[PDB]
Short mmCIF file of C-alpha atoms and ligand atoms in Angstrom, two decimals:
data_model
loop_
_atom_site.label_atom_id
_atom_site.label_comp_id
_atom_site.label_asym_id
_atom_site.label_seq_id
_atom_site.Cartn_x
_atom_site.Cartn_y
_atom_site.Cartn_z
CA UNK E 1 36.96 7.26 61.34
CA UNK E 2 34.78 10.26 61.29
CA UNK E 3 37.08 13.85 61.80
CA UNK E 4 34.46 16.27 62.98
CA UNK E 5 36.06 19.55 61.04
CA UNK E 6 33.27 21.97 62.52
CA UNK E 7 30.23 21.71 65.39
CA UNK E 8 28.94 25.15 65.24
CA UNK E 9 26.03 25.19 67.42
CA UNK E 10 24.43 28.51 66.68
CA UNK E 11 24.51 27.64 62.83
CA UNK E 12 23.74 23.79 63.68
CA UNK E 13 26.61 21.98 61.33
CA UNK E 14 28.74 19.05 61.62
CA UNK E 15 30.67 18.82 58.86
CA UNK E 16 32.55 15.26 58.89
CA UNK E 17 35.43 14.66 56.29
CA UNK E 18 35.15 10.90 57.04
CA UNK E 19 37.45 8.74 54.55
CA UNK E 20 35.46 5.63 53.28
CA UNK E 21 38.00 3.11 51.63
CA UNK E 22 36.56 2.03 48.12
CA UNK E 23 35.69 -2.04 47.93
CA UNK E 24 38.77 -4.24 48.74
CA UNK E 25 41.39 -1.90 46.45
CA UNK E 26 42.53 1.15 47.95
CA UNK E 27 44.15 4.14 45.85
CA UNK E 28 40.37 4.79 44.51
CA UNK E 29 39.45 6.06 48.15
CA UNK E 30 36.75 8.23 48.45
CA UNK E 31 36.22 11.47 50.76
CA UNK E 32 33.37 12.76 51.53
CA UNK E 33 32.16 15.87 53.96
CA UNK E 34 29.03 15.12 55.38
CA UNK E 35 26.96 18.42 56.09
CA UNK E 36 24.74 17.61 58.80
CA UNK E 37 22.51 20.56 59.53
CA UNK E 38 20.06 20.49 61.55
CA UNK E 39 17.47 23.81 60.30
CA UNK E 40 15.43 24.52 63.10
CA UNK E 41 12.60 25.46 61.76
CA UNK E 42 10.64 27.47 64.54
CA UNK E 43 13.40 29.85 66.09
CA UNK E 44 12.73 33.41 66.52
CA UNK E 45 14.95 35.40 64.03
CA UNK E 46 16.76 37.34 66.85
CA UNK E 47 17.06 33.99 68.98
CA UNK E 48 17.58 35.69 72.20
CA UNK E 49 14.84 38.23 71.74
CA UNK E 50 11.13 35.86 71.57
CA UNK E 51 9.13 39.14 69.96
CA UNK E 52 11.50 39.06 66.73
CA UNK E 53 10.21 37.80 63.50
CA UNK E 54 10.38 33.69 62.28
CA UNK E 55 13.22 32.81 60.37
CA UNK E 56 12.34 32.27 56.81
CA UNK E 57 15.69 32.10 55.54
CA UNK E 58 18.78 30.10 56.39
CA UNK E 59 22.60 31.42 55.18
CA UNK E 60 25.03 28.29 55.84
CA UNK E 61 27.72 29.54 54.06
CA UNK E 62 30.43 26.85 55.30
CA UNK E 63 33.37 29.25 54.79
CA UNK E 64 32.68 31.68 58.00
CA UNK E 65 31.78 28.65 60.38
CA UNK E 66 34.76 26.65 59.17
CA UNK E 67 37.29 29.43 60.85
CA UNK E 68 26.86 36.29 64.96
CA UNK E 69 23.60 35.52 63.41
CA UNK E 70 22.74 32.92 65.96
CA UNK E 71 20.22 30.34 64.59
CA UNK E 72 19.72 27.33 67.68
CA UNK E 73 20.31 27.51 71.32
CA UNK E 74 23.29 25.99 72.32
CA UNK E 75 23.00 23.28 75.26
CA UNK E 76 25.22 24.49 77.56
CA UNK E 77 24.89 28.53 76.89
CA UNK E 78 21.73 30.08 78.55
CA UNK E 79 20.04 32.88 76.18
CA UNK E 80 17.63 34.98 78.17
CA UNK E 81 16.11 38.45 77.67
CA UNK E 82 14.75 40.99 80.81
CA UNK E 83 10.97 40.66 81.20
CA UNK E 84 9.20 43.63 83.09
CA UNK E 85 6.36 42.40 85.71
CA UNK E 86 3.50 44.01 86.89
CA UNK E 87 2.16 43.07 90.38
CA UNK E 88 0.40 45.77 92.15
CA UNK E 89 1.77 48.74 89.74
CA UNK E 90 5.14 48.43 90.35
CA UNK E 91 7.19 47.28 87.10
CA UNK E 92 10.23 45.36 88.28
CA UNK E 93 13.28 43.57 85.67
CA UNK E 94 14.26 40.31 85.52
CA UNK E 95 15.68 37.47 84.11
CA UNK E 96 13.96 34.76 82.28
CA UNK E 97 14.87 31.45 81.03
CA UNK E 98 13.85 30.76 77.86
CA UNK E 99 15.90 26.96 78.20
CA UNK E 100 15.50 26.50 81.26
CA UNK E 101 15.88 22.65 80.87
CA UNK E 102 19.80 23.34 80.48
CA UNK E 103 19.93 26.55 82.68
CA UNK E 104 20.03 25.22 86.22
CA UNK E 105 22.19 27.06 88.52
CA UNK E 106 25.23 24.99 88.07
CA UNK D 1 -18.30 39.43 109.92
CA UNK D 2 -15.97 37.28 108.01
CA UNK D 3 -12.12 37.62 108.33
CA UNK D 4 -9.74 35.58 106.39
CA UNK D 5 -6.09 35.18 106.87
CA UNK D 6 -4.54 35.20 103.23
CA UNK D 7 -1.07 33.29 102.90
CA UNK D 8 1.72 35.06 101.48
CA UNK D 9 1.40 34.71 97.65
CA UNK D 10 4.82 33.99 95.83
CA UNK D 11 4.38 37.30 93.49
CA UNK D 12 4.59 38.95 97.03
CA UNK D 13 7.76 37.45 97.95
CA UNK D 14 9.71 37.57 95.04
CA UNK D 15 8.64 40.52 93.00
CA UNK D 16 8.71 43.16 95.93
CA UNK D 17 11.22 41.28 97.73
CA UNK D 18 9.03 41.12 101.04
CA UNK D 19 6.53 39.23 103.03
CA UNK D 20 3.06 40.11 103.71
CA UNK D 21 0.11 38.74 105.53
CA UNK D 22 -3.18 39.76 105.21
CA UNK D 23 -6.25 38.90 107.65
CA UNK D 24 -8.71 41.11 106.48
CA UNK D 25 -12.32 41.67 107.90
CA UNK D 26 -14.64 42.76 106.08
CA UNK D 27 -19.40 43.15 106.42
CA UNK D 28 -18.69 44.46 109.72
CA UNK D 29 -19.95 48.08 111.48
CA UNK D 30 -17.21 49.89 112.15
CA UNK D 31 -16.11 50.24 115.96
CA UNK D 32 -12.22 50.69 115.29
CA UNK D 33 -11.60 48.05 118.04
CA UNK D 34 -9.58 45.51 116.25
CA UNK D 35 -6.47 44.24 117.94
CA UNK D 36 -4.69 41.83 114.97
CA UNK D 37 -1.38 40.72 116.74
CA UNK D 38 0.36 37.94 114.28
CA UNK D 39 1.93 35.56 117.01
CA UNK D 40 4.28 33.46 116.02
CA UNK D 41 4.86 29.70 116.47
CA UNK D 42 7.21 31.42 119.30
CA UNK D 43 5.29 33.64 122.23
CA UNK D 44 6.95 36.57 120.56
CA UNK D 45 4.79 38.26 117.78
CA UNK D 46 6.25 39.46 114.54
CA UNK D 47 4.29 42.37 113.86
CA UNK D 48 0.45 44.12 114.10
CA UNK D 49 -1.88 45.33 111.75
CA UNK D 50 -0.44 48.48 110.16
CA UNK D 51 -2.24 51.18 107.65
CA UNK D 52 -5.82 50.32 108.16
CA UNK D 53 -7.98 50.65 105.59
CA UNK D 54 -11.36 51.51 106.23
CA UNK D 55 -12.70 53.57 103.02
CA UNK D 56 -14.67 51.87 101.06
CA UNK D 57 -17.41 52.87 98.68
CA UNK D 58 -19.50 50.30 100.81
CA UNK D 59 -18.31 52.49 104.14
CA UNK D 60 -18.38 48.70 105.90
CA UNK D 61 -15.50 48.51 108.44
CA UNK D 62 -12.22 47.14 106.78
CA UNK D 63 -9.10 46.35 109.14
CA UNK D 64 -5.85 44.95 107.05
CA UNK D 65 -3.33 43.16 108.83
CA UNK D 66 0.67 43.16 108.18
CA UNK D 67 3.49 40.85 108.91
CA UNK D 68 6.76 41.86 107.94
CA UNK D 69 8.83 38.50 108.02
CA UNK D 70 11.72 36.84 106.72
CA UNK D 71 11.66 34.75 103.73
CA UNK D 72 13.83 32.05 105.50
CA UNK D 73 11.79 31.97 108.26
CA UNK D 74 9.09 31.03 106.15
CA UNK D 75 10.42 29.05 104.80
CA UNK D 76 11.61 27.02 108.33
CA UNK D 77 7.88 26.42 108.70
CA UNK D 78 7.18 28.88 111.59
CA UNK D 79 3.27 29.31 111.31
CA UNK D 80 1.26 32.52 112.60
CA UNK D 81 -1.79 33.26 113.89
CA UNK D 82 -4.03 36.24 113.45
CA UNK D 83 -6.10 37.34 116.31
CA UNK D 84 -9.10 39.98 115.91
CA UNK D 85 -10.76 41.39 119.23
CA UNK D 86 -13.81 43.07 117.54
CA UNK D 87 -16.81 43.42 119.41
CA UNK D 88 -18.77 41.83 116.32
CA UNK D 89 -17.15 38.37 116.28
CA UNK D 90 -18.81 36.84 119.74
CA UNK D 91 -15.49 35.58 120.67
CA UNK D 92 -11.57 35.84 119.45
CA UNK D 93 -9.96 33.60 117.07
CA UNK D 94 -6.90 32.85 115.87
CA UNK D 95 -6.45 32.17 112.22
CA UNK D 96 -3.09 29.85 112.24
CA UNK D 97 -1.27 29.83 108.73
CA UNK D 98 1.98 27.33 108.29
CA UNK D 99 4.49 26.67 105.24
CA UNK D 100 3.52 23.43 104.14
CA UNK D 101 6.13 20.68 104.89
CA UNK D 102 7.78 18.07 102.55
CA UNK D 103 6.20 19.97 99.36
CA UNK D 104 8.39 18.87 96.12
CA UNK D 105 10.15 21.12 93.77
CA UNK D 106 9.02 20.19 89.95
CA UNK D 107 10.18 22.75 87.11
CA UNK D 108 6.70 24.72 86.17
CA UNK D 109 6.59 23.49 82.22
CA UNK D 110 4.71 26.49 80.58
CA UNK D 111 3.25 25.59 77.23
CA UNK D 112 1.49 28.26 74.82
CA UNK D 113 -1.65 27.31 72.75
CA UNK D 114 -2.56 29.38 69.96
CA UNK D 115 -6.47 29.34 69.02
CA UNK D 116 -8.11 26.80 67.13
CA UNK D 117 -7.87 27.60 63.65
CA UNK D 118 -11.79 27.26 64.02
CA UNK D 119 -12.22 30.10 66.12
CA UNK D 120 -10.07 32.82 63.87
CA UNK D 121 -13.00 31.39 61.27
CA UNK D 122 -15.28 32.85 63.49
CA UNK D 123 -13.78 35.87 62.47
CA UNK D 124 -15.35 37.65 65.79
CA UNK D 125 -12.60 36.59 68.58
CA UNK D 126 -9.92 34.85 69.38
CA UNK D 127 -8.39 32.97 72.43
CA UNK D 128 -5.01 32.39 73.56
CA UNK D 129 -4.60 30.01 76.20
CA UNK D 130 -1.63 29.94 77.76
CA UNK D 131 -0.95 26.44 79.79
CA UNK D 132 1.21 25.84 83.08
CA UNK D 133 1.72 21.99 83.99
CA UNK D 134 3.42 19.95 86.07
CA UNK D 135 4.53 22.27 88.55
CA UNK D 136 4.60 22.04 92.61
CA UNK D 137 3.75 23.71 95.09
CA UNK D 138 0.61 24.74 94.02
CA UNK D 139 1.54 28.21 93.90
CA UNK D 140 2.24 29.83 90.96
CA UNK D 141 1.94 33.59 89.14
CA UNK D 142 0.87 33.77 85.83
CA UNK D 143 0.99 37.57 83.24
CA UNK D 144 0.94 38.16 79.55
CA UNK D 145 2.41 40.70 77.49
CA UNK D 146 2.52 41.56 73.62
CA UNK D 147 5.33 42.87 72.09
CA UNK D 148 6.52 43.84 76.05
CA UNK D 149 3.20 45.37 76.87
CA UNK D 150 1.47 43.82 79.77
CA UNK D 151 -1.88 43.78 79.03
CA UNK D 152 -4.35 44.68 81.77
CA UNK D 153 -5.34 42.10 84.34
CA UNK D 154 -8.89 41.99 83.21
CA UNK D 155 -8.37 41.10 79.63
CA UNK D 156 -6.31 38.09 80.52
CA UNK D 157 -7.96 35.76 83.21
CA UNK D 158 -6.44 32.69 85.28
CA UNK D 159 -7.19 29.61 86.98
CA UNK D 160 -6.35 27.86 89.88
CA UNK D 161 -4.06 25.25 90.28
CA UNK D 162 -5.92 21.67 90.03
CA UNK D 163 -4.22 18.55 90.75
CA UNK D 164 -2.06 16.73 87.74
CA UNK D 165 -4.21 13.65 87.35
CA UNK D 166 -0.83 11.69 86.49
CA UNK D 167 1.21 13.00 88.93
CA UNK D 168 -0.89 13.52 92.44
CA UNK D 169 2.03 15.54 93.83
CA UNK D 170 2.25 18.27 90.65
CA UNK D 171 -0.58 20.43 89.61
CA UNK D 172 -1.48 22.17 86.35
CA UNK D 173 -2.84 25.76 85.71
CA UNK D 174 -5.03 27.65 83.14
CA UNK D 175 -4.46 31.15 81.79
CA UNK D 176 -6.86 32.89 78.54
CA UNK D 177 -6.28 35.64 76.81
CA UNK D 178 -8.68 36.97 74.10
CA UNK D 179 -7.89 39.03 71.36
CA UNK D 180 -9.50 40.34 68.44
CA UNK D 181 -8.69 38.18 64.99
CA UNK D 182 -6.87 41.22 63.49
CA UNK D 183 -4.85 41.74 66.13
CA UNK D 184 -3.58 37.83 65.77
CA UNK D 185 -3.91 38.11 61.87
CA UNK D 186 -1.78 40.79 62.73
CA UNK D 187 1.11 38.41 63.94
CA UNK D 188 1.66 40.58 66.89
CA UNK D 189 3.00 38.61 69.61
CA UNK D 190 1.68 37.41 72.69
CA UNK D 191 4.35 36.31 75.81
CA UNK D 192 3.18 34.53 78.75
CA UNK D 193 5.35 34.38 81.79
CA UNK D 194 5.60 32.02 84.81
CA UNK D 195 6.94 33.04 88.44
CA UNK D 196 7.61 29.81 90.58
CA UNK D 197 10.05 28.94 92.62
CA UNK D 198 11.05 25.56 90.77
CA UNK D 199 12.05 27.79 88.11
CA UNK D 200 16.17 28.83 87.93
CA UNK D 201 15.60 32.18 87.91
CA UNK D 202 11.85 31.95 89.13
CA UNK D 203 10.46 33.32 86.00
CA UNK D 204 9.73 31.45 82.68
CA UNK D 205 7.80 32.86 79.15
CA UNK D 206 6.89 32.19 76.31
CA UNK D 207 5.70 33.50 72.99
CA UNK D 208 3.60 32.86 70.34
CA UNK D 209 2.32 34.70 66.72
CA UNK D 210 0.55 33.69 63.81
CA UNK D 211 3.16 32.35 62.02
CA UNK D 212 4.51 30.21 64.69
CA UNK D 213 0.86 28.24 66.44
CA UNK D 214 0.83 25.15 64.53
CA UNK D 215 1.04 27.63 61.34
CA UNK D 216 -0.20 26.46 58.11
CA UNK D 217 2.84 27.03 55.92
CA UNK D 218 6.64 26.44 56.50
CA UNK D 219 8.00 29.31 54.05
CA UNK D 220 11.52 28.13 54.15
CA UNK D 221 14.87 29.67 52.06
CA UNK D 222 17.40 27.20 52.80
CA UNK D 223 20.79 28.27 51.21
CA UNK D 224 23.86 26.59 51.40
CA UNK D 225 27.33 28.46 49.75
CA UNK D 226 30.93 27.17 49.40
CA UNK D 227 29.92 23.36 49.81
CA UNK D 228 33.60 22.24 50.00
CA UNK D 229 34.43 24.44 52.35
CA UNK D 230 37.91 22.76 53.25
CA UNK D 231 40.18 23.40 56.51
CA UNK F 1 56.40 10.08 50.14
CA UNK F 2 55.31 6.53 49.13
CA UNK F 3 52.13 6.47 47.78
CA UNK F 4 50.59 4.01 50.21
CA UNK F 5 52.10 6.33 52.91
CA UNK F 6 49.82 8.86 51.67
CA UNK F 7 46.79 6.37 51.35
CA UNK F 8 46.71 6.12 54.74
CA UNK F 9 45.74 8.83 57.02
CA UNK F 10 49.03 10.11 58.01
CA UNK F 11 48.56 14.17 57.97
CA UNK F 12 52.06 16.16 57.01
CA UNK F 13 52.81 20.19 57.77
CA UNK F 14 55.49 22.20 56.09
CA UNK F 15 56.38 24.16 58.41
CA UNK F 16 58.16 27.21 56.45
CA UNK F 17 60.17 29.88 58.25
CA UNK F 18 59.81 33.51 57.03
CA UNK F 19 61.17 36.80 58.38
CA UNK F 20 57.57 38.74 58.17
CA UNK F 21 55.37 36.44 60.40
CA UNK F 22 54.22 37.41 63.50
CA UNK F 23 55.04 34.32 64.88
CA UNK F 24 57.80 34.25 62.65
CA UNK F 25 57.54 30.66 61.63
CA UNK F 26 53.91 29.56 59.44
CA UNK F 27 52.51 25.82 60.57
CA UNK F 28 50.43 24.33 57.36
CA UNK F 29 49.31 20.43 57.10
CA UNK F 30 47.27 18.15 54.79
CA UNK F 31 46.34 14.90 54.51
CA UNK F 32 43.79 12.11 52.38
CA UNK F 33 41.22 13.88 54.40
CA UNK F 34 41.71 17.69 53.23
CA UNK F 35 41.79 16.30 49.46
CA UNK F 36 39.30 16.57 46.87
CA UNK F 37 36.27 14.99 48.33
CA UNK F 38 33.71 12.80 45.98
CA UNK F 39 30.39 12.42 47.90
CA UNK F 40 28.26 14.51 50.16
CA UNK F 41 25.29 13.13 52.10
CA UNK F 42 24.58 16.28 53.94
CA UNK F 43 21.23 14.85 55.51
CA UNK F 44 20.28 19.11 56.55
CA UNK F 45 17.17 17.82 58.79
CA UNK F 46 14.39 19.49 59.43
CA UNK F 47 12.52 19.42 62.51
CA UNK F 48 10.08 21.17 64.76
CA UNK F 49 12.37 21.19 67.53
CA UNK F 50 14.06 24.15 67.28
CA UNK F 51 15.75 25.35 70.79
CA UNK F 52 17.56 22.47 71.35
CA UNK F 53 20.46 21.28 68.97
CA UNK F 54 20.70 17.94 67.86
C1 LIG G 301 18.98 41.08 69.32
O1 LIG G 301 20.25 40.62 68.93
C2 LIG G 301 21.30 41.38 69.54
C3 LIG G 301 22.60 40.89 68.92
O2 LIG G 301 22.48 40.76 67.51
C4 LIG G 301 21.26 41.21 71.05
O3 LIG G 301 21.15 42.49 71.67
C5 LIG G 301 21.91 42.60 72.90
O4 LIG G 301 22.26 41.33 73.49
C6 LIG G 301 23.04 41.46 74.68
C7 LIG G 301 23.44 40.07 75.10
O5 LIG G 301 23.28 39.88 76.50
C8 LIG G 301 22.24 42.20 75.75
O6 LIG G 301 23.04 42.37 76.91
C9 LIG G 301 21.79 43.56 75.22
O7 LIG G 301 20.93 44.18 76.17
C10 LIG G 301 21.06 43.40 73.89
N1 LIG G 301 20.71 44.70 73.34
C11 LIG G 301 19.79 45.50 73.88
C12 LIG G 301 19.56 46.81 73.19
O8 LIG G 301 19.17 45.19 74.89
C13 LIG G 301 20.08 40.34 71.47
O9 LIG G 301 20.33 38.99 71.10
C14 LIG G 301 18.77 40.81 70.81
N2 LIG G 301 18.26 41.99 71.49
C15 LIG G 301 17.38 41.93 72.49
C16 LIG G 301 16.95 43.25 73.07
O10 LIG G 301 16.95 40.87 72.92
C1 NAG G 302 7.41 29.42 48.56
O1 NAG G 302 8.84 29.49 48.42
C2 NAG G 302 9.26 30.24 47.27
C3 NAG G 302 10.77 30.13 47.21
O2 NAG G 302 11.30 29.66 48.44
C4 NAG G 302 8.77 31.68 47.39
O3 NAG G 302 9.14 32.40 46.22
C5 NAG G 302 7.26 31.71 47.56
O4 NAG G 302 6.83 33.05 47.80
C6 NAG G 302 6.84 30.83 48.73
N1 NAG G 302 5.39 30.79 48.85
C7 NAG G 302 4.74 30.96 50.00
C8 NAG G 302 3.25 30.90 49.93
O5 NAG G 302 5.33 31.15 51.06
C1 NAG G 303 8.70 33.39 51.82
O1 NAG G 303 10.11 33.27 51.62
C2 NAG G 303 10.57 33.94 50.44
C3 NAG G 303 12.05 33.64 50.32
O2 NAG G 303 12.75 34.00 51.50
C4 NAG G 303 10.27 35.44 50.54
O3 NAG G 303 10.66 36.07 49.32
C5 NAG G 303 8.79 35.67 50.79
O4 NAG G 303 8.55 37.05 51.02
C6 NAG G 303 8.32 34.86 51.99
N1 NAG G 303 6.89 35.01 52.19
C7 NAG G 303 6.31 34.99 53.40
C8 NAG G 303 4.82 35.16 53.41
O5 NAG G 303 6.96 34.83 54.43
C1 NAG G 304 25.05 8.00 50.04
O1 NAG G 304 25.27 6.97 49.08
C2 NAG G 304 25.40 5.68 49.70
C3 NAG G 304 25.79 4.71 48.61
O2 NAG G 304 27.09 4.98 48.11
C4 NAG G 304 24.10 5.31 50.41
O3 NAG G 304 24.28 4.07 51.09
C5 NAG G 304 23.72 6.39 51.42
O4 NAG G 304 22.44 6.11 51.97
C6 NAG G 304 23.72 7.77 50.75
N1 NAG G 304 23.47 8.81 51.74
C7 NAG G 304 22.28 9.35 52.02
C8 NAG G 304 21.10 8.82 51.24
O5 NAG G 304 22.14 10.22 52.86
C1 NAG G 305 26.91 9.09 54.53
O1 NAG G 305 27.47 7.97 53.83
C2 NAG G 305 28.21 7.05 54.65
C3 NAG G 305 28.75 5.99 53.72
O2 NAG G 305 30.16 6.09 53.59
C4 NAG G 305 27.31 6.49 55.74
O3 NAG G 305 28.07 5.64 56.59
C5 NAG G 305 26.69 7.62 56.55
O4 NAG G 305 25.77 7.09 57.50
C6 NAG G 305 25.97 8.60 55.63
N1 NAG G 305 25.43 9.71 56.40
C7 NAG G 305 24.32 9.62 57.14
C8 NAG G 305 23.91 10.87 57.86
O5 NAG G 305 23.68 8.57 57.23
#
């Protein structure tokens, strides 16, 4: 019965205007949206970029994610930053994997 | 008189895209009279020593071998042998190094350990540990950064890989850093990376600051606007 | 409509048709469900894991 209106996965939300039908007499039914947000608590505050500062503040303002400052990792996108490496001297880019449960070449 | 032959180390193959093998000799007089030939599993041999080194502040004889091979082949499980003809080993040998077969693939899970909240009391040093478990083959390449610095390679320090008690087939390994408490009072970051080949890309990190190692306080702003919010 | 029709969940549009649209014609629907809600139990968990959603 549940009609998932939004599932924004950067701003976790999953807003559900579910009707319940009151007791056994209908024409009293109640609506209700069910904001399910999940804060995360411990991502970076530029998610993609591990050396940014710890978010401290969350802005859910419903209106924008009804119709970006990226809060959680998605499952399926892969965010990743360069990374230089030093061996012998030589400094050489590349890619990292900062989920790399979900970020198997696929 | 001891020579060694050194198998080719992962940060080798991936981060300058090339193979080397070394079978160096070193507390030996110096005579120039090495012949280092890396046969193959086949007759044919790959390649020879190349760019001998000999200076040293000790001035004892140093010869360097090379072996130029492909990653695939390596990877097939051809092995190679290094031969050295010096007059100061009594006889030749052949030091015979192989890919090791049947070795499982398991995703290097690199976790980052702030220091005890004991030691910042100390108020003299403090230790960041940065953990690599579960991973196989044993191999595995291990660097730390702060705020994309890399920090020199003496101020961090590894260990080798040890076997997983759990899991016989994985292994776990052991990186430190040490900084001083100000710097971590600081918050500066700290990022340890992982190269290993059960990796996607081959190369993990992982970062950590003093408001993010199992921090004292959760300063949290949560604001929600527009409620309704209707569509 | 009836007013059990609309008690139900059975979502309406009225379409309009207007000269200065780009697509010419404007699509807009309702239903029980876009009304005037009455209760929110927006549970907003918090939790350690952070990467990972849900
Ligand atoms: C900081 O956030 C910004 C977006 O708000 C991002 O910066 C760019 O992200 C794209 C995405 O792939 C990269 O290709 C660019 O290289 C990034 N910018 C720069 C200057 O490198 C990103 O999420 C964060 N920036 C960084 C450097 O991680
Ligand atoms: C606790 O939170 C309030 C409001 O969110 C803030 O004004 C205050 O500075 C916070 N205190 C600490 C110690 O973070
Ligand atoms: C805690 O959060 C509040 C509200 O965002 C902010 O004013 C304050 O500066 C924060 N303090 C710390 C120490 O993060
Ligand atoms: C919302 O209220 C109902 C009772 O009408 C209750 O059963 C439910 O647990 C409440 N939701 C919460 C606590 O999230
Ligand atoms: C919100 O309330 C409804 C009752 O109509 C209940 O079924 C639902 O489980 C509640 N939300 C959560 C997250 O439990």
């Amino acid at each position: 019965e549940r009609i998932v209106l939004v599932d924004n996965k950067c701003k976790c939300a999953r807003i559900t205007s579910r009707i319940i039908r009151s007791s056994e007499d209908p024409n009293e039914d109640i609506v209700e949206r069910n904001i399910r947000i999940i804060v995360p608590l411990n991502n970076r505050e530029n998610i993609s970029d591990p050396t940014s500062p710890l978010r401290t503040r969350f802005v859910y303002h419903l209106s924008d994610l009804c119709k970006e400052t990226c809060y959680t990792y998605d499952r399926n996108k892969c965010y990743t930053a360069v990374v230089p490496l030093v061996y012998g001297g030589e400094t050489k880019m590349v890619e990292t994997a900062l989920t790399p449960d979900a970020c198997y070449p696929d | 008189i001891r020579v060694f032959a050194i198998p080719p180390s992962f940060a080798s193959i991936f981060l300058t895209k090339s193979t080397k093998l070394t079978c160096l000799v070193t507390d030996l007089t110096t005579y120039d009279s090495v012949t280092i030939s890396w046969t193959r599993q086949n007759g044919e041999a790959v390649k020879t020593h190349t760019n001998i080194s000999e200076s040293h502040p000790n001035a004892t004889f140093s010869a360097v071998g090379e072996a130029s091979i492909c990653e695939d082949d390596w990877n097939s499980g051809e092995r190679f042998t290094c031969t050295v003809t010096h007059t100061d080993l009594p006889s030749p040998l052949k030091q015979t190094i192989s890919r090791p077969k049947g070795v499982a693939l398991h995703r290097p899970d690199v976790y980052l350990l702030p220091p005890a909240r004991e030691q910042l009391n100390l108020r003299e040093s403090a230790t960041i540990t940065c953990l690599v478990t579960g991973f196989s083959p044993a191999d595995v390449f291990v660097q730390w950064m702060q705020r994309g610095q890399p920090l020199s390679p003496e101020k961090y320090v590894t260990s080798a890989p040890m076997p997983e008690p759990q899991a016989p087939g994985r292994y776990f390994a052991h990186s430190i850093l040490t900084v001083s408490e100000e710097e971590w009072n600081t918050g500066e970051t700290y990022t340890c990376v992982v190269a290993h080949e059960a990796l996607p890309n081959r190369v993990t990190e992982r970062t950590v600051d003093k408001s993010t190692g199992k921090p004292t306080l959760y300063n949290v702003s949560l604001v929600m606007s527009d409620t309704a919010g209707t569509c | 409509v009836s007013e059990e029709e609309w008690n139900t969940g059975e979502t309406y549009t009225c379409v309009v048709a207007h000269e200065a649209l780009p697509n010419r014609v404007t699509e807009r629907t309702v239903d029980k469900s876009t009304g005037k809600p009455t209760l929110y139990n927006v549970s907003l968990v918090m939790s350690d894991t952070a990467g990972t959603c849900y």
